C-alpha cells in the first residue's frame, strides 16, 4: 500500500501542539474564563 | 528456409510459414524444397510456434495494457495478469 506510515505521525503530532498553544493563549492572558 | 523457420517460430512469421488461425503455422506444402521424409518433421515443428504466437499475443494483451482503463476474471484481473507474468519466464 502507498500511504503515510511515518510522515503523518510527525505532522499530526504538531497540529495538536499548535491548537493547545492557541487555546491556552486565550485563557492565561486574555481571561476568556472571566467572561 | 533455415532462418525463416526460426523467424516464424520466434513470433515474426515467415513468408514460407504462413500464419493462419485454422492451421496455425504451416509449410507451403507445394514447392520443390520439401519432400515426404522431412514433411512429417516440418508438420511436427509447426505446432510449437503456433502455440507460441497465441501465448505471446495473450501475454502482451493482458499484461501492462491499461492503466486501470471486462469485469470477467477469466479474461481480466490481477490473477490472470499474474498468469501471463509467470508464462513469459516459463
Amino acid at each position: 500500500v502507498l500511504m503515510k506510515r511515518s510522515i503523518t505521525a510527525p505532522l499530526a503530532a504538531h497540529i495538536s501542539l499548535v491548537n493547545k498553544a492557541a487555546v491556552d493563549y486565550f485563557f492565561v492572558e486574555l481571561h476568556l474564563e472571566a467572561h | 528456409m533455415i532462418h525463416e523457420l526460426l523467424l516464424a517460430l520466434s513470433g515474426y512469421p515467415g513468408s514460407i510459414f504462413t500464419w493462419n488461425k485454422r492451421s496455425g503455422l504451416q509449410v507451403s506444402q507445394d514447392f520443390p524444397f520439401l519432400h515426404p521424409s522431412e514433411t512429417s518433421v516440418l508438420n511436427r515443428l509447426c505446432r510449437l510456434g503456433t502455440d507460441y504466437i497465441r501465448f505471446t499475443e495473450f501475454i502482451e494483451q493482458y499484461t501492462g495494457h491499461v492503466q486501470q482503463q471486462q469485469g470477467q476474471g477469466g479474461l481480466h484481473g490481477i490473477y490472470l495478469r499474474a498468469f501471463c507474468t509467470g508464462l513469459d519466464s516459463v
Binding site: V1, L2, T8, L11, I15, V18, A22 | G64, Q68, I78
Partner: protein, 81 residues
C-alpha cells in the same frame, strides 16, 4: 492512485520512481503554512484554495488530515498577533 491499482507487476518501480520525486514540492508547501504560517500558491493547484478570520477556501491525499491543515495555518497566523 496508479500505485494502488498496480503494485505487483513490473511497472511498479518505474511508477514509484516518478511519484517519489513528483511529491517533493507538495510536501514543502505543507511544511510552510504549518510551521511559519506562510501560505503557498503555485499556479492555483494547491489542495487548499484561496468574526471568522479566514481568507482561504477549502470546500489523492489523506482527507483525514486535509481539513486539519485548513485550520492549522490560521492558528499560526493568530499566534502572529
Amino acid at each position: 492512485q496508479e500505485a494502488l491499482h498496480n503494485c505487483s507487476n513490473e511497472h511498479y518501480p518505474v511508477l514509484l520512481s516518478l511519484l517519489k520525486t513528483s511529491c517533493e514540492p507538495y510536501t514543502r508547501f505543507i511544511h510552510d503554512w504549518v510551521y511559519s504560517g506562510v501560505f503557498r500558491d503555485a499556479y492555483g493547484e494547491f489542495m487548499i484554495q484561496v468574526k471568522l478570520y479566514w481568507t482561504h477556501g477549502y470546500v489523492v491525499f489523506l482527507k483525514h488530515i486535509a481539513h486539519d491543515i485548513y485550520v492549522c495555518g490560521k492558528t499560526i497566523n493568530l499566534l502572529k498577533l
